[PDB]
Design a protein around this ligand. Structure first.
Ligand SMILES: [Zn+2]
Ligand SMILES: [Zn+2]
Ligand SMILES: [Zn+2]
Ligand SMILES: [Zn+2]
Lengths: 156, 226, 56, 61, 129, 89, 196
RNA sequence: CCCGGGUAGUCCUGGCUGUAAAGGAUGCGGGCUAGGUGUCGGGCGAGCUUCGAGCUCGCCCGGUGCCGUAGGGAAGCCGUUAA
RNA sequence: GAGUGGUGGCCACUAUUAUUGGGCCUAAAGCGGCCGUAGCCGGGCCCGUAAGUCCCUGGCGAAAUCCCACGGCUCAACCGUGGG
């Protein structure tokens, strides 16, 4: 079920079982890498880059292509971005959660009586703390990193 | 051969009314094992009299419970007798029944008739760790049976061990032919009707357990008569 | 030792006093199909070992 | 229910009306698909399957 | 959330057997489940089974022969020595050598009878009968 | 702890008044001319100890188990309760 | 489409079911019309009619029983019984007929036929208790529970019931051999139909 | 208890109190176990349409009711929204 | 039966302490509801270590007590010699 609402929505993606890219893919690995870097320069997130590639360029997914520089792993948008030195400084989902938490706090400062929005903010902050703990364990950010409502504005 | 001649007399001066009765009378059925597992209905005690004539013996007939029940009327109290009884041969075949009457004798008669109608067939053997023999002195394996609130689990026991169960279950198993067993009962055992029916269901459930061909040899499984 | 009927659909044994049934196959006429109480209630299809014809 | 879930959306090989370019596009787009040459709209996103405004040559698996 | 796929599989097998299903599907697939199914097939409690790839952990298709009375995982996975099998047999089985206690040992998973024959112990991971 | 206390070698019936047991024991006492019920209970306890030993040894594996099985059979044969060709069954 | 022409089947309206449906009848369902009504399969109906006729030919006629409480099904059952020699009980089925030996009309058939399970719930329960095979004329809304031989048909229409029973009687007679060929059947279909 | 008046309160701003038959008298996450029939949201296919974000039928997902099979329960009853 | 009764205490009875192995709609029992710290429980595959786990093998865990066979007090209780 959902993390907080405890509902059982099942909408999602159902990809076919595949191990190699489909033949009808027009572009090659290098061309799709260039397209990914071009979209990142345009200023899209990883998810939006993948969606654009799937919709406009007819690329079902970059994960189907084997990584030329590492036979032991498949390609990935984040891996391509870090190869070209454009990966996020901090995780994108955490960034989005922090951004909307800051916006919610700004709204609550003007509307102190919005207790339901306050509860939503509390849930958002719990999710942020969960992500911070996970990334601390995996070493994706400094061990002393802590989420501060005051300091989060600078990150935003 | 008193029971044999009793069966002959019944078969002579009995007029079948049902399909199974006609089968028995004409002779299409000769052994009691044929009337089970076929879906036939047993509604004539003469069938059981002919096929298991020994169930009419007093030693083979057991009256378990006698209770007085009361109905209230503007006049007063209307008393009735409920008799729970069990019959069967001490080899494979046992039956349990309930009867109601204005008199204890009528209740006993009706209960015996219904027990004969409800007679069933069981499986016996030995599946205990401390016996490992190949005789039909106990239940082949552990079984369970519940009626109402009473749950009874019967477990195999070593040869020569008495029936470690309540009096009602002990009498039922003795009539069924089982001689050695261990028991575990939960719920209100003082409810004689429910306790007896739970023991009966546990004995019946021996036929609901899937077994392999070698298990028959291993546990000395015997169906019905031995 | 007498043989004990076995259900045709599930393959389980048939207890002495269950609402089981048996009948000649309605397609060939030589095979005997047994249906146990549970299979009959659940309306589970049976397939004749001889014909291969399937039905309830 | 299904043992192996299978997508109910296909990839469409399509002809652009304005310029005639070949393209391969998704049948359930979350954006507004545009021709890479003339920048003309090809598919309209909606709650589900989009509305195709360009000729459909082929329906790939 | 999902905790023990093996327990899920065994519970599903028992549930579907009680209603007489001829075929079952086990999801997700794991090598422990595969080995347990192999042991069950060896002992004749199930029919043919196969592994299906679906881009995920995988699936198992299993045929039921209407022979299982009850199958279930054992938890916690109690460690057991060679000389400490009678108590577990009494706990989990109706009669001696009636069912099979699936045990994971240092030489793979196998029936408790096979473990006794080989003179080794392990952990009790399931039981079937 | 506590030191050793010499325990009784016979057991008392779980219920002092049961019709079946009372009749059976009365028949046995009248037939064999025993002075008191504790003699009969002592003999019953001897029997029960023998059966318990047999049951424990049946489901036992080991060299000591085999030695105990052989010793039990030999002791029973010497007492004369079993034929020379008897087995643990 | 061998026993009778598909045109005759459609005219009798044996392929018209009911607004409801059932997973048990999913296989027999042909399609659903745009008004929501489900249509059965004439080919499956024909095959099942042949199978039922062959199966019933093996039983001694006086041991076959037919039951129908529906007014539009009473007459076809009576005609089928009086033709094949099988016993027929149109209208109410007095409880205890099969289970109570003290009933005046006590009888223990070897095979039972029900025009409709839901209507003949009492007869089906008695048959289940007695332990004999059951053949049921099942519609789309019916349940195949406790049914040993199902005939997919419109068990409510007068014409459909009359045609089904006529075909069944002809099939039983042909299989039993009382008639050399199907063409030897002289009784008209119209008699099976109920008067209006 | 019925009738005529009536203060606190019921209302707004800032705080405290943390109590209810706050009861689905049923804690929460996961897998499995016949069906039928209404209604809400979304999606898909088909037929109408006054072309309406309109109407009718079927299917998938998620909610919300009723009846009900195996099974459960002392029973009342629960039964894929399990007890 | 040379014992047999009365009173207090412990165990079984008691699945009325429930790991084996109890219950929480209406009988005692689900926090009024949520988020979260420690703890407990944790998706699939590949490789490495042997901490846990299993097997084998040395040094131990006194004697008496406990079980078995034999021998000595008449058998026994009791002791002695071997095995556990
Ligand atoms: Zn034995
Ligand atoms: Zn069956
Ligand atoms: Zn056949
Ligand atoms: Zn273009």
């Amino acid at each position: 079920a959902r993390m907080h609402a405890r509902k059982r929505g099942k909408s999602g993606s159902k990809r076919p079982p595949r191990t190699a890219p489909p033949i009808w893919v027009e572009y090659t690995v290098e061309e799709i890498e260039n397209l990914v870097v071009k979209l990142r320069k345009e200023g899209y997130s990883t998810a939006m880059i993948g969606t654009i590639l799937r919709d406009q360029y007819g690329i079902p997914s970059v994960k189907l292509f084997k990584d030329p520089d590492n036979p032991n792993r498949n390609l990935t948008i984040t891996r391509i971005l870090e190869k070209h030195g454009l990966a996020p400084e901090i995780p994108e989902d955490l960034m989005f959660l922090i951004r909307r938490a800051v916006n919610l706090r700004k709204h609550l400062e003007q509307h102190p009586k919005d207790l339901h929005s306050m509860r939503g903010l509390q849930l958002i902050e719990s999710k942020i703390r969960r992500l911070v703990k996970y990334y601390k364990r995996k070493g994706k950010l400094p061990k002393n990193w802590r989420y501060d409502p005051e300091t989060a504005k600078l990150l935003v | 051969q008193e029971w044999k001649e009793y069966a002959k007399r019944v078969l002579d001066e009995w007029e079948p009314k049902t399909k199974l009765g006609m089968m028995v009378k004409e002779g299409q059925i000769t052994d009691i094992h044929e009337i089970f597992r076929r879906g036939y209905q047993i509604k004539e005690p003469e069938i059981i009299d002919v096929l298991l004539p020994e169930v009419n013996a007093r030693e083979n007939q057991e009256v378990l419970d006698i209770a007085l029940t009361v109905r209230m009327t503007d006049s007063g109290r209307r008393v009735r007798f409920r008799v729970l009884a069990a019959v069967g041969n001490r080899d494979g075949y046992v039956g349990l029944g309930i009867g109601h009457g204005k008199e204890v004798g009528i209740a006993i008669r009706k209960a015996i008739n219904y027990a004969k109608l409800n007679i069933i067939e069981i499986k016996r053997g030995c599946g205990s760790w401390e016996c490992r023999c190949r005789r039909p002195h106990s239940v082949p394996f552990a079984v369970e049976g519940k009626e109402g609130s009473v749950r009874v689990r019967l477990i195999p026991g070593p040869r020569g061990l008495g029936l470690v169960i309540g009096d009602v279950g002990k009498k039922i198993l003795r009539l069924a032919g089982v001689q050695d067993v261990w028991s575990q009962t939960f719920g209100e055992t003082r409810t004689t009707v429910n306790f007896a029916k739970a023991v009966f269901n546990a004995l019946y459930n021996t036929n609901r357990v899937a077994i392999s061909p070698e298990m028959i040899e291993r546990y000395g499984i015997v169906v019905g008569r031995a | 030792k007498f043989e004990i009927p076995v259900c045709t659909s599930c393959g389980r044994e048939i207890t002495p006093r269950e609402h089981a049934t048996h009948f000649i196959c309605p397609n060939c006429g030589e095979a005997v199909i047994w249906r146990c109480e549970s299979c009959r209630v659940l309306a589970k299809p049976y397939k004749c070992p001889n014909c291969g014809w399937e039905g309830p | 229910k299904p043992i192996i879930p299978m997508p109910r959306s296909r990839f469409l090989r399509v002809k652009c009306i304005d310029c005639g370019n070949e393209q391969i596009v998704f049948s359930h787009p979350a954006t507004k698909v545009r021709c890479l040459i003339c920048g003309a709209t090809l598919v309209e996103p909606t709650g589900g399957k989009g509305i195709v405004k360009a000729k459909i040559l082929e329906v790939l698996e | 959330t999902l905790l023990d796929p093996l327990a899920n599989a065994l519970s599903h097998i028992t549930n579907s057997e009680r209603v007489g299903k001829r075929e079952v599907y086990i999801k997700p697939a794991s090598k422990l489940i595969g080995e347990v199914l192999r042991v069950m097939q060896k002992y004749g409690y199930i029919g043919e089974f196969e592994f299906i790839d679906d881009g995920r952990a995988g699936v198992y298709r299993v045929q039921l022969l209407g022979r299982i009375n009850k199958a279930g995982a054992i938890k916690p996975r109690f460690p057991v020595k060679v000389s400490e099998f009678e108590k577990w047999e009494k706990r989990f089985l109706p009669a001696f050598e009636f069912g099979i206690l699936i045990v994971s040992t240092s030489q793979g998973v196998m029936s408790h009878k096979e473990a006794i024959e080989k003179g080794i112990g392990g952990r009790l991971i399931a039981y079937v009968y | 702890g506590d030191p050793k206390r010499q325990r009784k070698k016979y057991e008392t019936p779980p219920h002092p008044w049961i019709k079946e047991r009372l009749d059976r024991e009365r028949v046995l006492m009248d037939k064999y001319e025993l002075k008191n019920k504790k003699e009969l209970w002592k003999h019953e306890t001897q029997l029960k100890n023998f059966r318990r030993r047999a049951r424990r040894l049946l489901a036992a594996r080991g060299k000591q188990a085999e030695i105990e099985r052989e010793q039990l059979l030999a002791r029973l044969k010497r007492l004369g309760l079993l034929p020379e060709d008897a087995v643990l069954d | 489409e061998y026993l009778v022409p598909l045109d005759q089947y459609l005219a009798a309206g044996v392929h018209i079911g009911t607004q409801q449906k059932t997973k048990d009848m999913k296989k027999f369902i042909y399609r659903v019309r745009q008004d929501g009504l489900y249509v059965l399969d004439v080919r499956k109906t024909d095959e099942r009619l042949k199978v039922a006729g062959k199966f019933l030919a093996k039983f001694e006629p006086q041991s076959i029983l037919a039951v129908s409480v529906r007014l539009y099904g009473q007459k076809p059952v009576k005609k089928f019984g009086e033709v094949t020699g099988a016993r027929a009980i149109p209208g109410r089925f007095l409880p205890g007929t099969m289970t109570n030996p003290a009933v005046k009309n006590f009888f223990e058939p070897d095979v039972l036929i029900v025009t409709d399970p839901r209507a003949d719930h009492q007869a089906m329960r008695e048959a289940v208790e007695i332990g004999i095979p059951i053949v049921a004329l099942v519609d789309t809304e019916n349940l195949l529970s406790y049914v040993d031989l199902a005939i997919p048909t419109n068990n409510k229409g007068r014409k459909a019931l009359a045609l089904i029973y006529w075909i069944l009687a002809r099939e039983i007679l042909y299989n039993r051999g009382e008639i050399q060929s199907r063409e030897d059947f002289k009784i008209p279909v119209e008699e099976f139909e109920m008067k209006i």
